Amino acid sequence: QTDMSRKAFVFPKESDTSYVSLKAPLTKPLKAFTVCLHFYTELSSTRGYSIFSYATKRQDNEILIFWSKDIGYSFTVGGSEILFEVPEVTVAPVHICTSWESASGIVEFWVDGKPRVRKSLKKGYTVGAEASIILGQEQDSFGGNFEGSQSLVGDIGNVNMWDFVLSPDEINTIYLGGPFSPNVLNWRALKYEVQGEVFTKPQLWP
């Protein structure tokens, strides 16, 4: 476990082999979650990349957040996809939170502490506990099958993940830097594994 407070991982050029592998302590399968993070890149109006990748040996897009060109954000759990379109694109660092709850199948998508309309996705699913979480590359198989054309080029940081659903208040206090307490993934106690060209440096966002 390592405190990465104030730091970030950076991926400086396109590649096929660079990535960070987060280890989570899961034992029970997920019936809801929240995930939040910060990232910064110029890719957005030239191609598309993977922002967060969650995979079991049985499904490779279990949960996955992804930017795709000329459309917008693309959230998917259990192989099924949903869209939040962005018309105007602009360059600056971005903070997102994203949550999903089985029973209702409602997903919320927060961009910079403002929320998008709610949507429905895979009501009643339960997400698998033995997983491969990966920054920088997109998985087409447990642990691997990366695609250079889906690479993150820039830095990414502040990834935290809870196994329940954050309320609008709590997402405001994470956004503003207030203390929270993750129970699946904690930036102040990370357990990760690096490979290829990725550096750890100070963060460009407040």
Output the known binding site for Ca(2+). 60-61, 138-140, 150
Buried b (16+ CB within 10 A) or exposed e, 13-35: eebeebbbbbebeeeeebebbbb
- Nearest residue to 187 via CA among 153, 156, 143: 156
The 3-state DSSP class for residue 90 equals coil
Between CA 199 and CA 19, with CA 97 as vertex, the angle to 5 degrees is 25
Compose the 151-170 pattern: x for residues touching a copy of itself by CB under 8 A, - for all others: --xxx-----------xxx-
Residue pair 49/41 in contact (Cβ under 8 Å)? The answer is yes
Q: Is 70 in the site for a copy of itself (CB under 8 A)?
A: no
The strand pairing partners of 72, in sequence order, are 68, 85
Q: Is 140 in the site for ligand PC (CB under 6 A)?
A: yes
Residue 188 binds: one of Ca ion, a copy of itself, ligand PC, none (C-beta under 5 to 8 A by kind): none
Residue 145 binds: one of Ca ion, ligand PC, a copy of itself, none (C-beta under 5 to 8 A by kind): none
Strands 7-11 and 199-202: antiparallel
Q: Is 150 in the site for ligand PC (CB under 6 A)?
A: yes
Q: Is 202 in the site for a copy of itself (CB under 8 A)?
A: yes
Label residue 72 left, alpha or beta by phi (over 0 means left) and psi (-120 to 50 means alpha): left
Residue pair 200/9 in contact (Cβ under 8 Å)? The answer is yes
Compose the 31-70 pattern: x for residues touching ligand PC by CB under 6 A, - for all others: -----------------------------xx----x-x--
- Nearest residue to 23 via CA among 62, 54, 44: 54
Shortest spacing between CB 43 and Ca ion, in angstroms? 15
**Which one of 140, 164, 165, 175 is in contact with Ca ion (CB under 5 A)?**
140
Residues that bind ligand PC (CB under 6 A): 60-61, 66, 68, 74, 76, 81, 138, 140, 147, 150
Residues that bind Ca ion (CB under 5 A): 60-61, 138, 140, 147
Residues that bind a copy of itself (CB under 8 A): 10, 12-13, 40-42, 85, 91, 104-106, 115-120, 153-155, 167-169, 197, 199, 201-204
